[PDB]
Write an enzyme that holds these catalytic residues in place. Structure first.
Site: not given
Length: 129
Positions: A35, A46, A48, A50, A52, A59, A101
């Site tokens: 990562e 990103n 979009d 967002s 990381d 994210n 989650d």
């Protein structure tokens, strides 16, 4: 900070990740390697909207709040900047939440593509525990 492999393994062990939800320590070390290359300051912005953040590339749409991401859920209840610390505590706590989650380690694309099916024990081999 850029961690060493064994140093990160020890830190993660101290924070309870070995066998957390059935995932051995080497899985976690492997995930961090692919990562972020062990870099606590890593960021990936990103297209979009967002971002990381940190050693585990968590994210900003679902997990942490950066104030700039559409659809923010902030399920770890933390500012994303907490994930950029030299101490890994916030990243580990949020990683635990991600699996709690209802996700497994498939949440991390680098784990699924570069760690799953491999000898993950290699990542902790030779280290002082």
């Amino acid at each position: 900070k850029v961690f060493g492999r064994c140093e990160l393994a020890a830190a993660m062990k101290r924070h309870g990740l070995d066998n957390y939800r059935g995932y051995s320590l080497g899985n976690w070390v492997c995930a961090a390697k692919f990562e972020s290359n062990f870099n606590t300051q890593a960021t990936n912005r990103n297209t979009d909207g967002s971002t990381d953040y940190g050693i585990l590339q968590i994210n900003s749409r679902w997990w942490c709040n950066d104030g700039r991401t559409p659809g923010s859920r902030n399920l770890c209840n933390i500012p994303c900047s907490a994930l950029l610390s030299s101490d890994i505590t916030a990243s580990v706590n949020c990683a635990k939440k991600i699996v709690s989650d209802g996700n497994g380690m498939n949440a991390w694309v680098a784990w699924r593509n570069r760690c799953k099916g491999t000898d993950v024990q290699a990542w902790i081999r030779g280290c002082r525990l």
